[PDB]
């Protein structure tokens, strides 16, 4: 199998909704030890992230029934720490990728992709910071914080406001202020900074991702409406 | 979920996005 | 871990909709080589249903993939191929499980139960017979209707027409004449007969179960209609 | 898919069967 061959069955993988075997085939395409084009980035995105939303999905029903509910008690709560297993795993196979070859091997003129994956890394850790205690919580929350804090500096100086990926980067980053850090009003700075900063340059939009720009624009706005 | 919902692509129908965001 | 704790775990894992640990654990139910409740044997049959489901939409949606497309329709017939031994796995699976446990051990008086498995069985050879050519679907196909047929006679003679899983059974007895055996009229057959054998016996209603009883019997009237 | 598309048990809201029919 080449690597044309293994992103086909990516694409086969997620249409037919088989997101673990999109993940091993976009994980082996990382593995060839290239650079990921913009679909192999996003195939690989989309594949660990439904991946882990289904392990995240499944760990809030079984966190509520432990809350809710010898034996019993006993079965719940090593279930759920069989999920949370199973999450942690997914998240530490995502930035093994991140930290050993996407991150790694990035030019120096390739910030939109630097910024890509230290978002990625920031999401990861996330993911692992809500179901992580103590002080293994601590420590993921703080590797979640040094990723989007550098993803966001990148993208200040080199990338558009209106551009997408900087965009979404702020709606991550506002939403681990006020989810993980329970800090709302930095969560409303981060997230009312960038759309604001997007619409005063509105005729920087680009002809190609216009309709994400504004989208996620309104996911901003979405929650700040929330959250104010 | 309060985070981006959808992958920033051209080739994701902006219908499945709209979707994934409602 | 004891059987109450297996039957927790395939309670939570249905909650959580992990169904792969669902099946899994009622698999292990049944090799503990006794009988099943009425909840146990339900529980077994919604995790097979729901992994071998998945693999079903699966299988449709690359099939569909396969009829509308060098090295890209090798991969997508390859990944067809891959989804289609993971399906016989599963249906092969279940039938192990009723041939040499539950329809095995069943006693002489217990009708629904033998009915119930014989069900299944027809069941599983019938998602057989969805993906199988040549003389493996006529061999799959003609194990699908003795198990089907079986289990009609055994509902004739001992269960009211009422009775929701005498009902069920012709529901898909019917289909497997409509969508197997190209056989429009004895599905047609199949289905009106269940469906008025249960209206002229209305009577015969369950306090436990009229509810799925009423309910089967629009399913079967739904199928009338499309096929009329 | 024209088969049984619910579990027969009193257990599973009625419902849950009606959203699985239809
Ligand atoms: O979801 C795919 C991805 F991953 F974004 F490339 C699609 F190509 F379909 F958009
Ligand atoms: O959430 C927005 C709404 F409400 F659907 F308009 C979005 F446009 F982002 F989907
Ligand atoms: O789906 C369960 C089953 F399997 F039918 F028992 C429930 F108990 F929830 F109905
Ligand atoms: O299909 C029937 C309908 F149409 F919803 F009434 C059923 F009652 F069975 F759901």
């Known amino acids: 199998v080449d690597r044309e061959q293994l992103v086909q069955k990516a694409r086969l993988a997620e249409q037919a909704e088989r997101y673990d075997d999109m993940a091993a085939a ?3 395409v990382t593995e060839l030890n290239e650079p990921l084009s913009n679909e192999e980035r996003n195939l690989l995105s989309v594949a660990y992230k439904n991946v882990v939303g289904a392990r995240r999905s499944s760990w809030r029903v079984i966190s509520s029934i432990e ?5 019993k008690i006993e079965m719940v709560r090593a279930y759920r720490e069989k999920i949370e297993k ?20 990035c030019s120096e003129t390739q910030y939109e992709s630097k910024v890509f994956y230290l978002k990625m890394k920031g999401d990861y850790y996330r993911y692992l910071a809500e179901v992580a205690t103590g002080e293994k919580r601590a420590t993921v929350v703080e590797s979640s914080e040094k990723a989007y804090s550098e993803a966001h500096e990148i ?32 969560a409303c700075h981060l997230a009312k900074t960038a759309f604001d900063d997007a619409i005063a340059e509105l005729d920087t939009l680009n002809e190609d991702s216009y309709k994400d720009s504004t989208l996620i624009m309104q996911l901003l706005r979405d929650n700040l409406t929330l959250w104010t | 979920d309060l985070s981006l919902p959808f992958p920033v692509c051209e080739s994701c ?3 499945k996005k709209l979707r994934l965001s409602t």
């Open chain 1, 26 to 28: 976009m994980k082996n």
């Open chain 1, 67 to 71: 809350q809710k509910t010898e034996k």
């Open chain 1, 86 to 105: 199973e999450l942690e795993a997914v998240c530490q196979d995502v930035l093994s990728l991140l930290d050993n070859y996407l991150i790694k091997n």
């Open chain 1, 155 to 186: 993208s200040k100086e080199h990338m558009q406001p209106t551009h997408p990926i900087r965009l979404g980067l702020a709606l991550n980053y506002s939403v681990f202020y006020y989810e993980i850090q329970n800090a709302p009003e930095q």
């Open chain 2, 13 to 15: 129908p902006l219908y």
